[PDB]
Design a binder for this molecule. Structure first.
Ligand SMILES: CNC(=O)c1cc(Oc2ccc3nc(Nc4ccc(Cl)c(C(F)(F)F)c4)[nH]c3c2)ccn1
Length: 292
């Protein structure tokens, strides 16, 4: 499967001595995600800020492969605007295993959205300057549109994310969002983003990612709220879920967006929309929103 993917070190290998590791950006059992400086990793710059995911110096022989798979998969997928850009890696012996991606200034979308709760209006109005730097339904529909586009792309190159959530979406410059993974596909309570077929039968498909995409939409339109607020993720949660229970509409959604969340939460994988359809439907909503 993944282990069998090609790592062309001549094109991605980067000198560990050209990286000045900085402040941690996130922790994990696998190891860490650190901010850093790359001396001439790309060409349009001399010194660039990059994000680096790396294992613990005493990391298992298993994770070492997990991280190598991610590197191979990211390479296989190729470049897309809404997928965090892979810049390089460090496989050679000597230092720990490291994957290097572009740095996204504003970090994960969940945190970001939460900080704009008191800076959000559905639609801007004149003066129009009293709203400069406010989030609007257009922004939210756009973020969802972009993620759906990146997932369509992942589908296209036949890959699945496995843990699609707001915390794994990064806000870059000019309202451009990028899909990423701070983990190595847990205090992050991942069951909240899993489709029933995944929870009960541990089966991961592109359609279960669509279920996750539904939780992400609820996250975006709750302005960063936490999925299944207050609810205890236990035996009964898994049960109720399979029985057909879903979350109520978030605080800033629109009738259509909430319906789309529901569409994504169909109990039947094959009854859930597909990312292409989602990209088309969302695009419509975006364009329908501008009008009014
Ligand atoms: C304030 N800025 C940040 O906190 C920050 C962290 C960051 O961390 C990383 C560092 C390395 C990474 N490697 C990934 N893997 C990844 C990214 C996208 C996709 Cl689609 C897939 C997978 F596995 F699904 F193919 C895997 N995500 C990563 C995220 C990258 C950019 N900005």
């Amino acid at each position: 499967h993944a282990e069998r993917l090609p790592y062309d070190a001549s094109k991605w290998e980067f000198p560990r001595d050209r990286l000045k590791l900085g402040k941690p950006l996130g922790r994990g059992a696998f190891g860490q995600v650190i901010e850093a400086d790359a001396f001439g990793i790309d060409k349009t710059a001399t010194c660039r800020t990059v994000a680096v995911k790396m294992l613990k110096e005493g990391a298992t022989h298993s994770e070492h492969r997990a991280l190598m798979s991610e590197l191979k998969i990211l390479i296989h997928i190729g470049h897309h605007l809404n997928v965090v850009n892979l810049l390089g890696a460090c496989t050679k012996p000597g230092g720990p295993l490291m994957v290097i991606t572009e740095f996204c200034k504003f970090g994960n979308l969940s945190t970001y959205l939460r900080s704009k709760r008191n800076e959000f209006v559905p639609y801007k109005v004149a003066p129009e300057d009293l709203y400069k730097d406010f989030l609007t339904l257009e922004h939210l529909i756009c973020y969802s549109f972009q993620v759906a586009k990146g997932m369509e792309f992942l589908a296209s190159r036949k890959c699945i994310h496995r843990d699609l959530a707001a915390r794994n979406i990064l806000l870059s410059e000019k309202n451009v969002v990028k899909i990423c993974d701070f983990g190595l596909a847990d205090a992050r309570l991942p069951l909240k983003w899993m489709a029933p077929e995944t929870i009960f039968d541990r089966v991961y498909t592109i359609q279960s990612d669509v279920w996750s995409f539904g939780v992400l939409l609820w996250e975006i339109f709750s302005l960063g709220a936490s999925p299944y607020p207050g609810v205890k993720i236990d035996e009964e949660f898994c049960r109720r879920l399979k029985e057909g229970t879903r979350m109520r509409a978030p605080d800033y959604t629109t009738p259509e967006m909430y319906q789309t969340m529901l569409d994504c939460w169909h109990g039947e994988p094959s009854q859930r929309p597909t990312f292409s359809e989602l990209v088309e439907h969302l695009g419509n909503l975006l364009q329908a929103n501008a009008q009014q």
